[PDB]
Amino acid sequence: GFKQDIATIRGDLRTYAQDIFLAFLNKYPDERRYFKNYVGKSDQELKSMAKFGDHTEKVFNLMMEVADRATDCVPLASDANTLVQMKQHSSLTTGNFEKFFVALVEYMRASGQSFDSQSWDRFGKNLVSALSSAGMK
């Protein structure tokens, strides 16, 4: 289930973080504009820029903390608030996050593994609701 998925992802966090982030960018290429240093780089090229592996790992660490603190895939309003108020997220809207979670859920479905894809889809929906409830446009 969802708790085990947190454990699976944490066990190899940099690998899943890179793969899922790349799946997002490659599914939604317009989103790469927000990540100036990644423009014009292939998957394997990104995998040698220090900021890439370090940024993606930090993003997924936070996402796992938010997931772990959730109750029945509903995140804490304080964790939504943190994500809205981050300087790095100031120009984002909820659609950016919707896209991210579409890519994440698609990744999990395509994986050979028994990820609880439906729980991640619900978590993403509830996080987007919570971002909106916290004032994200």
Positions at the binding site: 36, 38, 51, 55, 58, 88-89, 97
Q: How far apart are CA 21 and CA 18, in angstroms?
A: 5
Report in angstroms how near the CB of residue 89 gets to ligand HEM at its nearest: 6
Task: Tell me the torsion sign for CA atoms 91, 97, 103, 104.
Answer: positive
3-state helix, strand, coil in the chain (%, to 5): 75, 0, 25
- Regarding 102 and contact with ligand HEM (CB under 6 A), the answer is no
Buried b (16+ CB within 10 A) or exposed e, 95-112: ebbbebbbbbbbbbeeee
Query: Which of 20, 73, 84, 92 is close enough to bind ligand HEM by CB under 6 A?
Result: 92
Report in angstroms how near the CB of residue 84 gets to ligand HEM at its nearest: 11
Q: What mask, x for binding ligand HEM by CB under 6 A, covers residues 27 to 66?
A: ----x--xx------------------xx--xx--xx---
- Regarding 6 and contact with ligand HEM (CB under 6 A), the answer is no
Q: How far apart are CA 38 and CA 51, in angstroms?
A: 10
- Regarding 15 and contact with ligand HEM (CB under 6 A), the answer is no
Question: Six-digit token pair at 101?
Answer: 């979670």
Binding-site ranges for ligand HEM (CB under 6 A): 31, 34-35, 54-55, 58-59, 62-63, 88-89, 92, 96-97, 100
